[PDB]
Design an enzyme around this catalytic site. Structure first.
Site, PDB file in Angstrom:
ATOM      1  N   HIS A   1      56.021  54.792  58.358  1.00 48.05           N
ATOM      2  CA  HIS A   1      54.565  54.801  58.429  1.00 48.05           C
ATOM      3  C   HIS A   1      53.988  56.102  57.895  1.00 48.05           C
ATOM      4  O   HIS A   1      52.844  56.103  57.436  1.00 48.05           O
ATOM      5  CB  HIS A   1      54.080  54.468  59.839  1.00 48.05           C
ATOM      6  CG  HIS A   1      54.027  55.635  60.776  1.00 48.05           C
ATOM      7  ND1 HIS A   1      54.966  55.844  61.756  1.00 48.05           N
ATOM      8  CD2 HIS A   1      53.094  56.610  60.939  1.00 48.05           C
ATOM      9  CE1 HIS A   1      54.651  56.925  62.451  1.00 48.05           C
ATOM     10  NE2 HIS A   1      53.512  57.401  61.980  1.00 48.05           N
TER      11      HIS A   1
ATOM     12  N   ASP B   1      60.948  51.786  61.459  1.00 43.79           N
ATOM     13  CA  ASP B   1      60.008  52.811  61.044  1.00 43.79           C
ATOM     14  C   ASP B   1      60.743  54.069  60.581  1.00 43.79           C
ATOM     15  O   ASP B   1      60.607  55.147  61.143  1.00 43.79           O
ATOM     16  CB  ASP B   1      59.064  53.120  62.197  1.00 43.79           C
ATOM     17  CG  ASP B   1      57.887  53.946  61.759  1.00 43.79           C
ATOM     18  OD1 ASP B   1      57.625  53.970  60.539  1.00 43.79           O
ATOM     19  OD2 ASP B   1      57.255  54.582  62.626  1.00 43.79           O
TER      20      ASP B   1
ATOM     21  N   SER C   1      55.372  62.182  64.590  1.00 41.29           N
ATOM     22  CA  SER C   1      56.024  61.135  63.800  1.00 41.29           C
ATOM     23  C   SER C   1      57.068  61.784  62.909  1.00 41.29           C
ATOM     24  O   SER C   1      56.768  62.728  62.178  1.00 41.29           O
ATOM     25  CB  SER C   1      55.001  60.413  62.937  1.00 41.29           C
ATOM     26  OG  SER C   1      54.058  59.732  63.765  1.00 41.29           O
TER      27      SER C   1
END
EC number: 3.4.21.-
Length: 237
Positions: free
Chosen positions: A67, A115, A190
């Protein structure tokens, strides 16, 4: 047990992050940033789009989230990797290993629903790969992890502090459905590396997901399972 979870979650989020106890969340100091595994951690920067984290796992290879990579729209020129970047509280930015350009984005080599993404770096202007200056992270496995385990999540919590590496202690929970854990994170985390006590990379932080019911949440990461490990071995360079 929703009330149990609320109490536990609220240990990380019921107070302002600057007031969190240091064992749960702390800035990585200058001396520690130079040591393994902190020195494998960098800022994945998609200028104007996102500022998050990645882990150096190969001589020219950074592991981050799909992402995060998707913000680049398949264009390597839009992404840079800034290993061990530090911007102090007074605006002085240091990049001890330089800023690395990206030669190729592998946006979803593990599948669109996993992801993770691989960013392949150019060498520096002298031909020195980042992995010659910094030993890449040792790749472990998530297969032995168990509910309740304590791990260290290391990355760049942009929304808390810009370009300041922090560590977060995480506590695994309900692994029957992926790597889930209590811990303090923000969106910039992230791509943070999740390391065991032996300094082995066992997972990558992704995001927060619903948990127990539709009105509560938990942190989710991608473990270095059998599948992820296979693809890393195939694609690493």
């Amino acid at each position: 047990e929703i009330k149990k979870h609320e109490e536990k979650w609220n240990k990380y989020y019921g107070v302002n992050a600057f007031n969190l106890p240091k064992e749960l969340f702390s800035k990585v100091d200058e001396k520690d940033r130079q040591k393994y595994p902190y020195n494998t951690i960098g800022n994945v920067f998609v200028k104007g789009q996102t500022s998050a984290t990645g882990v150096l796992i190969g001589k020219n290879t950074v592991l981050t989230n799909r992402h995060i990579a998707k913000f680049a729209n398949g264009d390597p020129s839009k992404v840079s990797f800034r290993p061990s970047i530090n911007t102090d509280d007074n605006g002085n930015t240091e990049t001890p290993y330089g800023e690395y350009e990206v030669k190729e984005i592998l946006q979803e080599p593990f599948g669109a629903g996993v992801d993770l993404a691989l960013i392949r770096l150019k060498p520096d202007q002298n031909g020195v790969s980042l992995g010659d200056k910094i030993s890449p992270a040792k790749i472990g496995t998530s297969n032995d992890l168990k509910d309740g385990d304590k791990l260290e999540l290391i990355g760049y919590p942009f929304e808390h502090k810009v370009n300041q590496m922090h560590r977060s202690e995480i506590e695994l929970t309900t692994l029957s459905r992926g790597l889930r854990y209590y811990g303090f994170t923000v969106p910039g985390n992230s791509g943070s590396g999740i390391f065991n006590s032996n300094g082995e990379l066992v997972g990558i932080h992704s995001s927060k997901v619903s948990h127990l019911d539709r009105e509560h949440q938990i942190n989710y990461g991608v473990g270095i399972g059998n599948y992820v490990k296979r693809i890393i071995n195939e694609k690493n360079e």
